[PDB]
Amino acid sequence: TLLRNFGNVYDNPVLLDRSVTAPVTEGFNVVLASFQALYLQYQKHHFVVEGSEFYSLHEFFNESYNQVQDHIHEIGERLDGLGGVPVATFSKLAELTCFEQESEGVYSSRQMVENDLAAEQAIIGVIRRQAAQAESLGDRGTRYLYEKILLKTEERAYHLSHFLAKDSLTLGFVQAA
Amino acid sequence: TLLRNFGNVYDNPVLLDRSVTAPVTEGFNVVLASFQALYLQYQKHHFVVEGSEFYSLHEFFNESYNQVQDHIHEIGERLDGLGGVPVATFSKLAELTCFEQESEGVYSSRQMVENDLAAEQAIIGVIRRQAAQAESLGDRGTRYLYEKILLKTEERAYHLSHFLAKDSLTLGFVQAA
Amino acid sequence: TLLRNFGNVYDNPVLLDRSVTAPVTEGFNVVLASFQALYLQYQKHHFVVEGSEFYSLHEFFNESYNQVQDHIHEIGERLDGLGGVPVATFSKLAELTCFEQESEGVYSSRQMVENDLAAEQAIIGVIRRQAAQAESLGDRGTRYLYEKILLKTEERAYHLSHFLAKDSLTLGFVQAA
Amino acid sequence: TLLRNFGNVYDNPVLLDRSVTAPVTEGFNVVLASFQALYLQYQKHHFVVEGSEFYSLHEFFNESYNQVQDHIHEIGERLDGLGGVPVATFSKLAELTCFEQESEGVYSSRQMVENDLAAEQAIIGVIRRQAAQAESLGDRGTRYLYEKILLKTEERAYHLSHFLAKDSLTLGFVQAA
Amino acid sequence: TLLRNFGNVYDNPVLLDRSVTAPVTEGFNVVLASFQALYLQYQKHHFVVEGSEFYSLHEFFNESYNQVQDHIHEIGERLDGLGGVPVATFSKLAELTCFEQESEGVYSSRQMVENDLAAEQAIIGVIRRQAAQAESLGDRGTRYLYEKILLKTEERAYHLSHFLAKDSLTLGFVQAA
Amino acid sequence: TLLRNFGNVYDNPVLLDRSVTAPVTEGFNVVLASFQALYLQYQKHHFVVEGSEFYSLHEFFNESYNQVQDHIHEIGERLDGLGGVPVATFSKLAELTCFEQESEGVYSSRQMVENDLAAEQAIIGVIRRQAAQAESLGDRGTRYLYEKILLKTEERAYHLSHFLAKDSLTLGFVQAA
Amino acid sequence: TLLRNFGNVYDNPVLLDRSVTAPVTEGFNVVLASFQALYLQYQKHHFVVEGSEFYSLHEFFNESYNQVQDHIHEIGERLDGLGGVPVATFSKLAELTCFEQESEGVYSSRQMVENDLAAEQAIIGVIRRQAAQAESLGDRGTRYLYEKILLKTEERAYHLSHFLAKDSLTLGFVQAA
Amino acid sequence: TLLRNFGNVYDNPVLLDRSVTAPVTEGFNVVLASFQALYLQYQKHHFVVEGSEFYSLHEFFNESYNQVQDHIHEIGERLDGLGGVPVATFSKLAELTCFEQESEGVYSSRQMVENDLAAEQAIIGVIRRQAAQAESLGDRGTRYLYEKILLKTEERAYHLSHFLAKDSLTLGFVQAA
Amino acid sequence: TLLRNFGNVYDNPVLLDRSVTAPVTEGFNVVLASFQALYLQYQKHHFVVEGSEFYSLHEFFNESYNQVQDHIHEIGERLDGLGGVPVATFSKLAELTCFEQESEGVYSSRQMVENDLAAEQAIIGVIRRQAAQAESLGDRGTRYLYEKILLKTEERAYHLSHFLAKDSLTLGFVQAA
Amino acid sequence: TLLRNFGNVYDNPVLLDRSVTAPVTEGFNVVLASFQALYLQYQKHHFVVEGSEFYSLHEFFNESYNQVQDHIHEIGERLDGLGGVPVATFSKLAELTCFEQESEGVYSSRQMVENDLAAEQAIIGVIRRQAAQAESLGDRGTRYLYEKILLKTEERAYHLSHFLAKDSLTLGFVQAA
Amino acid sequence: TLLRNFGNVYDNPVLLDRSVTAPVTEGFNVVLASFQALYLQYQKHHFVVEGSEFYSLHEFFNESYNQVQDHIHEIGERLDGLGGVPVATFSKLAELTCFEQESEGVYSSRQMVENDLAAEQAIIGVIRRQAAQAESLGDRGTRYLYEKILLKTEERAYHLSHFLAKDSLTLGFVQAA
Ligand SMILES: [Zn+2]
Ligand SMILES: [Zn+2]
Ligand SMILES: [Zn+2]
Ligand SMILES: [Zn+2]
Ligand SMILES: [Zn+2]
Ligand SMILES: [Zn+2]
């Protein structure tokens, strides 16, 4: 027997109307699910990446999914505290993620980085909207948190595109395309 | 003989008109006094709480009043830097606190948590208004600080209501109301 | 609804007669009140001190009230262990404290340091009496605890006194009084 | 081939008469044996405690027997330092300990905590006696050391006492008495 | 041969139009250059300051230029990530700084602090405008960062004016102006 | 009023048949006893060892009984974890330990080291059988825990044996046997 | 004047038959000598590696020979602990190592990594053989220790393998084959 | 209003004739200017490097300018101790630096690394001369200080040079020049 | 031009009659002298001790004089704190120390340890009287400080005495006296 | 029973001729004795300093004598290592120190700092002489070590010099001359 | 397929003539070999040393070979840094080491310490020449690195020599030679 039913918003101890908490927590669950998806994906890439830049990429992928882990944790707690019910099942996570997970199998280094950049970008799009929704609704707490997370998320996307840039020390002695 | 008289706003080194600093510092003193009140109260509860959840509650109350201590410190410095005069006397603190302190004596665990939740809630109300006042007045510095503090304050209130929730491991073998 | 009334003393588990714990805890409340008064004052001094020796005085007041804070912790917790009820409201704090708080407003460096010294001296008075009373009444625990706190209290008094001394590196190139 | 016999006191390097060191070390071995019994009993409690407060009690017990281990260390070193022979065999520890160990088997949480409170209480009794003795015989060191230990041991008794207090957050939705 | 030409804005991985990134990165370069200027100046002051408050001022100047160093680092990375080209040459830094650097030579303690306060103040003015520009342009990421930096920058200016305040412990025994 | 009787094995949450947990936990209780005695003995030696090598041996005995205490912790919890009841009374420890404790009194340092070595060797034999048993019964968790403990226990025997070897720097200027 | 001869096994304090300790230590000295060769070769690689992946490889090599140094430590101590005599001269290390060192001079990065992969591979071969032997002869400790080492050593082999994988981010703008 | 003019040298307290400190401090200013130039360049490289080796180069430039920063600290502080006036304006920095800063804009990885190497080499030139001059003039302190910095400077030069080498793991599966 | 004459006691900020601070600080100055000499001696032994036990004794002498340095710090400050003038000249230290320093030259390690033990014992006697005095005069702060120092000082004597005991591992293979 | 006589040099293990070690250690004992005098004088200054700059000076003095303690350590160990006998008695330290200690009693802050500057200066004189000697006699180690120490000691002289500089923030509101 | 042949010196990025780097790096390779052998020997002694002083010597040998490993690191990199090829084969190490390794087998602890001392002394002689050479050739970086290593290497010889001195605590109760 249940204490909170999924999809529902309950009482919150911080004086916020449900006209605020319901859409806010709804957004949180899309963000939360999205980051579980990215966490899994970054973690995978960490596991499987190989090649000349394996070591750099290895470390980066691990840094990334830990940083994502911390985002998830802040959201989960605030989501619940605001009176919503955080998503956790595989199938519901799949239905709520804002990007499609990279398929099973090991792709190339470049493909992996591309897929992760696209992921962050999707997430950045939702966060910006959700921050704006929070601002208009007067939940400065939620807006502030989103902004914190956006900065870190946008930094990962910077790092991701720096990897993909068409430059190398090797161009001094290899034959370009 | 005095360098700054209480109730008065002086020169500030950060290019802000007194049409900003006077109401901002005024708000700060209400917040500051409020947190001294909560600090004292959380500290008391730390001292006196007992019962089955004594240990959990013991630790939480201590965490809480340290976190409040840090809020007070940021406010005090900014209040003074903006040219105001931070409140410090018992009687003035009493006149400016935004909630009434729990009375002398040891109440029950539940009563204590209730009283602290109500305290945070009061404070949350003022902070939201003061953040908005800062935003409109163009003191982004003060707004940002308030938002930082709001998030932590709202987290304590979450934790506080989780304590009060009518659930327990014991319900598996005790007789409910 | 209460469990313990202020001014009364209840069962302790450390096998001390109530004839001992009543004046000991009553003395502790006087010491606890005074120290919070002193903590509030040091903290204010930390916020508001300005001038040439600002930086030194600033971190010294910060040191002093963290130390005072730790006295408050140990005292409050023991006070309660002996079956006492610790003071925590602005009004009872005001009438139990053994010195007059610096009035609101910003005073000079020299004047702040001077009323901090006066405060510590008042407290040094009470603590010696309270210690004697505890030794006399056969409470080693309290006597020893008071002594720990006494040594650090006296030390602050030395440090305060050294700030006040009439010597400076500037006497080599500025006019004297 | 022996070198020192249990029961006899030997040379000490700290100018204490042997009429002082002999009862001081007798009292040490009683305190030492009693703290060994308490350490084991706490450890056992750490190992076996169950129920809704399991987590809290289980880490409280571990903090407790660690802190008791610390006492055992200081006492044995000073004991031997003063020319005494520390107890160490199961059979002798059994006869010197100032309280009877909990029986084998597992008891309930309220029971385990009461046992430990009774045990600390018996030891508070000895340490006060022994501390008086040392003060009387002019052995400041031992007196000072007993008081450090008394303070912590009295504090462990509060904390056991608070666990036992008939109060809970659960009283707000479970039937009393 | 070049990958990015100075003065130009390139692709950014965080879905921001160049109507946003171009003015934002432009502002960043003015801020960046400004902080290099202050870093140098604070570092100099650290090197050369002497007199009665040499030690306090020594430490403060060093704290300050490290804190400025961290501001520079966040800006540089975000500037580049947004697709701009961070300034780094002496002459371009000089043309873009928002205040004039203090001249070569060692000035007095007071003059140095005055010059640094004026520097911060200049920078505060630009940051407030650039934060507002970011807000209106919808770059919450950049706005948030600026706000972070503003708070620290405004704190240094507070500390700076506290140094300059016309108060001293010495006034108890020296002859005022 | 007990919950579990010493000598019975109760239910476990790790899917092990009681034909497995009964002998396993019997075994654990012998090893707990033995380590418990070894700890006391190690600690005693630490308390009393003197002579030329006093400092090395002091340090070593300390490290030794700390490490043994870690073993006791792991076993005690897994003993209880498998539905066993851990031994904690002086009387039952003596009956279950696999070696006979050093007698009361201080022995020579060589005799102490020899006594500890024989203690470790008594415990090594019990662990190898008890590990061999758990392998055959299907308890990999217990088998692995034992091998972990065996490795450290064998290392203490190496170190013990080295202390006892008939070599010394002094052999270059003192007479041999 | 010798005391133990290389080649012979001597007394051990851990109740292992000498028919066990003799082949176990022979295998140790082979593993020990092979890890010395690998350590040197890694070190060399650390010293000499160049090219676009220099930084990554150069810190990977350092992590690697550090982790190999750790193996060398555990093995030598147990070796000697078991009554063996560890190899230590250049000439004998040369004949016991299970793989031929890379020749003097500097090779390429792809070459250095292949050499190290071949070296780890040869050692994985020995450790499995030796681990089987120890299990067979009833020496759990040695078996357990070989497996700790096998795990890390297999993991170093993945990482060398991944470096060698024919994939790169550079494939997106440089010509393959 | 000045206290010390740039280009002039004043009283030191370390008993060195002004004939020594004048060329030593003048050399220090050349070295200080160059290193800030280098610090600005490494920092820019840290901001802007992109491509396959981005991650490695990124944290290497970060390491390099923290190290360079520490050279700047020691040099500036000693320069002033010898009675000198340290350079800190953009214009005098430009004319004292012993190499030409990389022009504005983003260059290739290889090209960045290449002008960092050129910069270090120019500085290695000056430092050897300045060191010789200091030994020659009888200033051990400076000679030694230059040597500390020389060793780390040369080391960066090695590291830079290794990035530039024409070897890569990619040469096994990409076309050569 | 003095501010305070050695041999006078001046004003104190801790409310103590000069009939108390005069004898107390006389006493402090004897103990400061004595510890100051003991530090030199401890440090010397550290510099020169050799032989078989050189390493243990090296470590121990080091720890010993560090700990003594801590004592010197506490006394010196409280000496000055009570309005005394602390001794710092070589000549006045010799006249005031309560034991005669070991003569110049290296003695045997046994003689060094014996000399340190007699030093500690000389200081123990002075501390017990000086503590006894402060108890009777009403200076609890001083009495407690002394007991703190007494405890550590007695422990060094334990350790010293243990080094001197006529036991050794070597007694199992070298000839006795 | 002596083993080495003060004044004579003995065997050293580092292949330095005794014609080298004898003057090098004479110079060591002069440096050693002078640093002991400085350490005491700094300590004294730490204990006694008062006035508006008390806090700054009081922690500067403590950093200073700690850093001097470090010198004393390196010098004594090398001294003895080179076969010398380190000075350690009050009377001999008095005659070997290269500067006369400040007299007993307390002086002013400007006075204490001048004394310490004079003291460091005298020592800078010796260390340069001794460093030249060591270079000349071919003892690189000692030369290198003297230069490490010279650098710090010259740096302590700057800092003392800066304290003394006739400049203050107070000049902007107090009357000069 | 090599890139560099052992025995050739190649190009360097630190502006040194090959008439300098050729002899310098030849020298480095002898010292690398020698330290490499010394490390093995130090580590061996660590593996096998036993007897009364086993614990001290155990610790010391460990510290010793760690410190030697640090030397090997610095040389190896600067060797390669100067365009040299570092030795890493067993065969070439033997031919280049400047001392002959201790033979296989365990020797007495005194013989081990004596062997290490002669090893250090062999290496001290090589370093002094190799440093003398680099001074004359103009390689200050190498000269300074050597002096750094010389200082620590001389200290290990001090410590080695002290272990060997004919003194012991046991001389007060065992027969001399
Ligand atoms: Zn959490
Ligand atoms: Zn603060
Ligand atoms: Zn507490
Ligand atoms: Zn101990
Ligand atoms: Zn960065
Ligand atoms: Zn546990």
Ligand SMILES: [Zn+2]
């Ligand atoms: Zn080891």
Ligand SMILES: [Zn+2]
């Ligand atoms: Zn500095």
Ligand SMILES: [Zn+2]
């Ligand atoms: Zn201090």
Ligand SMILES: [Zn+2]
């Ligand atoms: Zn040392």
Ligand SMILES: [Zn+2]
């Ligand atoms: Zn390295």
